[PDB]
Amino acid sequence: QAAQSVDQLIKARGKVYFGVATDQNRLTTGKNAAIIQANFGQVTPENSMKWDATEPSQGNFNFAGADYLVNWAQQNGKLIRGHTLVWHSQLPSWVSSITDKNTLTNVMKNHITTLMTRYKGKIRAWDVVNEAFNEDGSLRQTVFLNVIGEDYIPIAFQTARAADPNAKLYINDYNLDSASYPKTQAIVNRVKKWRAAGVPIDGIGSQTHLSAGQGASVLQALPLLASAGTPEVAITELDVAGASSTDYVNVVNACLNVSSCVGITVWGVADPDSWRASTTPLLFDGNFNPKPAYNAIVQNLQ
């Protein structure tokens, strides 16, 4: 654990949390648990709440990993973001073989309702729809789009709102890091249109998987995301190739500058456990010691 908590420091600046992705396999090995206890205020399950983990066979739900994380977080005073309900990746083949609109709609609604009702009142925010946009800003042609149509997004959010009215409902995506990117403009426009039609979208999540030197762009992109008029925005899956302090401090300052930015989640604790470990992109090194970027964030927040 680092001595100074970035979560406590960001809360002193008026934000809700600084958190991390984790799961049972992390929490039960190494120094992960102690680091999360001391330094972070929020957890996102890295894998245990995805469709493949939770409903591997239709109607045959598996909550073992998800329950472990929720209970651990509650015991340890950490906020939870649920991740993720509707996504084309980590989707079992029984779902993607369905070609009937009514069948898939009911499957999707049942998946949403079952997961959200189990944890009702315990989960601050859910990523309801993940990675719904192509890079040109059109909607990604996933099984949900192809079989249900564009209404799948409204249906997913309406169903989620009914299941747990206390949760903040997010749409989450990546490559929203530059204000001039086609995808960034498109998500803003479509979220404005959906909200004007009554769809309950409370948040835009920006994954923020950055390359070295790209942090500066977030200073301009995040205010543009906030212009869509959702109550919240968040940085949901931050990591930065090379872990330069300059990039990490820029992302934190972007969130500080945008009132509706509630917090930041970094996508893991220690470099070797990252999905792109070879780029050493996280705040703790392979020996579980804080990196200079951690200390730079602390100093920026003080």
From Swiss-Prot:
Catalytic residues as annotated in Swiss-Prot or TrEMBL: 131 (proton donor), 237 (nucleophile)
GO BP terms in the entry: xylan catabolic process
SUPFAM superfamilies xrefs: (Trans)glycosidases (SSF51445)
UniProt xrefs under Pfam families: Glyco_hydro_10
EC code(s) of this entry: 3.2.1.8
Location of Pyrrolidone carboxylic acid modifications: 1
Domain GH10: 3-300
An annotated Gene Ontology molecular function: endo-1,4-beta-xylanase activity
Uppermost EC category: hydrolase
Record's catalysed reaction(s): Endohydrolysis of (1->4)-beta-D-xylosidic linkages in xylans
Name of the protein described by the UniProt record: Endo-1,4-beta-xylanase
Lineage of the organism: Eukaryota, Fungi, Dikarya, Ascomycota, Pezizomycotina
